[PDB]
C-alpha cells in the first residue's frame with residue numbers, strides 16, 4: 007500500500023525521508039538545483055493543514071525513486087520546514103494550473 011498517493015504515483019515513508027534529507031541539506035548549505043531553484047520557499051497560498059510551523063520549503067520527490075538533481079521536477083513535492091520537520095506531500099496532479107492538492 008502507499009504511504010502517500012500523488013495522482014498515480016505511490017511513495018512510501020522511506021521515499022519521502024530520502025527526498026526530504028536531500029532537500030534539507032541543500033537548504034542548510036544555501037545551495038539550489040534546477041532551473042526553478044529547488045529547494046525554494048513554499049508560501050502555502052493553498053492554505054493546507056500543516057501541523058508544523060512555517061517557513062516551508064518544497065523539493066521534488068520523483069516517481070523513479072531517484073533524488074532530484076535538476077531537469078524536470080515532475081508534479082510531486084515534499085514540503086519541510088526549518089527544523090527538518092515534514093509538513094506534507096503535495097502535487098500538482100489533479101489541481102488546476104500550477105496549484106497543488108495534497109497527496110492522500
Ligand SMILES: Nc1nc2c(ncn2[C@@H]2O[C@H](COP(=O)(O)O[C@@H]3[C@H](O)[C@@H](CO)O[C@H]3n3cnc4c(=O)[nH]c(N)nc43)[C@@H](O)[C@H]2O)c(=O)[nH]1
Nearest residue numbers: 042047048049050051052079080081098099103104105106
Ligand atoms: N507532471 C506534471 N507536472 C506539472 C503539472 N502542473 C505543473 N507541473 C510542473 O511542475 C512545475 C511547477 O511548480 P513549481 O513548484 O515549480 O512552482 C511554484 C508554484 O507552482 C508557482 C506559481 O505559484 O510558484 C511556486 N510557489 C511558491 N509558493 C507557492 C505556493 O504556495 N503555491 C503554489 N501553487 N505555488 C507556489 C513545473 O516545472 C511544471 O512542469 C502537472 O499537472 N503534471
Ligand SMILES: [Ca+2]
Nearest residue numbers: 017018021071
Ligand atoms: Ca518507492
